Design a protein around this ligand. Structure first.
Ligand SMILES: N[C@@H](Cc1c[nH]c2ccccc12)C(=O)O
Ligand SMILES: N[C@@H](Cc1c[nH]c2ccccc12)C(=O)O
Ligand SMILES: N[C@@H](Cc1c[nH]c2ccccc12)C(=O)O
Ligand SMILES: N[C@@H](Cc1c[nH]c2ccccc12)C(=O)O
Ligand SMILES: N[C@@H](Cc1c[nH]c2ccccc12)C(=O)O
Ligand SMILES: N[C@@H](Cc1c[nH]c2ccccc12)C(=O)O
Lengths: 134, 134, 134, 134, 134, 134
């Protein structure tokens, strides 16, 4: 699937994380107020990160950061962290992406990892419905 | 498909059972109050077990343990047991997983077993509807 | 697809009939009052038989025996019989399964047979709707 | 797909026509009052003919003869005839099946023929809707 | 998909145009008042033409000529013409089929051509909706 | 999928852009007032451009230029520009198509590029909904 980002201010940044064993951001793009971006998940990229005031549209619904198979994480407060579990018999926990208040994350279940653990106060969007940690 | 677990208290534990001839738990993870976990069925794992106060969301619906193709078993009282039948001409009965009151189980129909027998008082969720043993 | 059986009394029995040229029951299982069973059609088995007071859930709907692609046969009275036609140019009639009052049958259209003839007073469930012989 | 026939009287007969270059009936079966038959289209058979008082259920709907991809033809009066066109560059017209009042026909679009011409007064059922020649 | 033609008068004619580089009519059939024809698009034929008072049923809806992936063209007045564009880098315009008032055309997007230009006053039916040139 | 263009005036022009590494217009066609065109995306072409008063119909809805997987861009004012990101590890920005007020653009996500950036004031149509930059 594909997602849409609209910038409500200047300073909105988006990051692309590689599909593979490790989860780090390799590219970053800057959006100005009123600009809109459309992107699709590809072989290289399986997840993205969003920071700043912006509007996000997805099949699950439309999400705004100012308000107070794939999944979406929105950080309600500071200290939000997410971990990913390795596929197969392996039992490692090596993924550490911290989301500050107002930031948003989107990721897909790939071969290298198809199970995720989430920490802190955040809002989760899924095909079933919307979930609030608090 | 994939499922979501939300912890309403500390002490919530989840177990992963291997896909194969035998059904035993090999890994266990601990969730704190307010944490949320998302996982998908993979080649290694075909079923899971849940104990403690937690909220579970599935395509069939949202299930809570505090209230008093794949299937979900919720133990209404103690003494709940489940058995699985072997595929093909074989007629063995070698699966014994006991669920205490408040515990929940989720499993998929795999090649090694695609028929299940359930004992005791429990609540069953399926694509057709919700069933109560009592 | 898969079906669900719930036992309203003790003495409920279920039979599994082999997928192949001949239609005979090779395995039988016993259910106690309040127990529930879930099974899926496999390579070995293409049809089943049910006797006694029980509740059956299917995509077509939920069926109870006490009330007075695949198909379901419920025997309204004694003397219910079913015959199956052989696939291809062959014109044999070699299937004889008699259903007593209250018994239920479920079968799938397989390569060896994809056409069925029914005798006696019975209730038929199909993807189109419910049919009564009387 | 598959169809269902229910007999409202004795003397109801059904015919099976072969899938191939020529369209003739090779087998015939007799149904008694209150009996029901279920059959599926196979490699050998691509069409059938029905005569007498009977009830027919199909995805398009339920049809009764007493009332006054595949298609269904019901003869409103005597003199109903149907012709089939050969696939490809050929322009022959060699199919002649006459339907008397009350008779019903069902056929599938096969490789040897995927275009049909109909004569006389008849009622036609299709995935789009019901059509009356008069 | 397949379409249905019903003749409201005598003199109704239907034409079949070949699937290939060139678009000419090779076969023609005559329908009498009250007759009905059903045909499916095949390898040889990708489009048809209809003239005279007739009733046409399609997934988009039912169309009548007397009223004053594939597409349907109905000529509202005389002088209606249609052109087809060649697939790939080629930029030819070699298709000229003129439709008189009351005539109807149906065609499919094939490998040799998947883009069409229409002239004159006509009514167009598509999966999205009905369009009127005027 | 395919799209439909209807011309509300003379002077309406449509352009076809090649599927490949570079995005330039190779062919151009002229439409007169009241004419209608239907075209489908092919191997050669993955996007188009529209200028002038015209009516466009798409699965997302019907769009008119006079009003004041694939996506549609409508330029609300002058200065609208769009950029496309290269698939894979590459991080180039080499696409520059400027849309004047009233012009419309349609494009598909291809192998060479599946992520787009948009500038200026424009109206965006997607399977999720309609988005306005302002
Ligand atoms: N390492 C496991 C992770 C996993 C899958 N399903 C689970 C259910 C519960 C806990 C862990 C898991 C895997 O093969 O993907
Ligand atoms: N051993 C059987 C189990 C089974 C399948 N379908 C059934 C129906 C009824 C009872 C048992 C079964 C198998 O091949 O899977
Ligand atoms: N012996 C036939 C039975 C059959 C199939 N379709 C039918 C329709 C009507 C009557 C009989 C049949 C076969 O090849 O399966
Ligand atoms: N002989 C033609 C018959 C046919 C197919 N499609 C048609 C549409 C209209 C008229 C005739 C036809 C064929 O190849 O099958
Ligand atoms: N010759 C072009 C025709 C075409 C396709 N899409 C278009 C869009 C606009 C104009 C022309 C076209 C092709 O490869 O099919
Ligand atoms: N070059 C990247 C572009 C991209 C894909 N997904 C993204 C998400 C955010 C930013 C850029 C991207 C690619 O080919 O996939």
């Amino acid at each position: 699937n594909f997602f849409v980002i609209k910038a409500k201010e200047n300073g909105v940044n988006v990051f692309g994380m590689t599909r593979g064993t490790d989860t780090r951001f390799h590219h970053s793009e800057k959006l100005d107020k009123g600009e809109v971006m459309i992107a699709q998940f590809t072989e290289h990229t399986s997840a993205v990160k969003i920071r700043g005031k912006a509007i996000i549209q997805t099949s699950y619904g439309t999400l705004d950061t100012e308000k107070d198979n794939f999944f979406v994480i929105k950080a309600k407060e500071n200290g939000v962290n997410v971990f990913g579990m390795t596929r197969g018999t392996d039992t490692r926990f090596h993924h550490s992406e911290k989301l500050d208040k107002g930031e948003v994350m989107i990721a897909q279940f790939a071969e290298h990892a198809s199970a995720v653990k989430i920490r802190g106060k955040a809002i989760i969007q899924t095909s079933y419905g919307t979930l609030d940690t608090e």
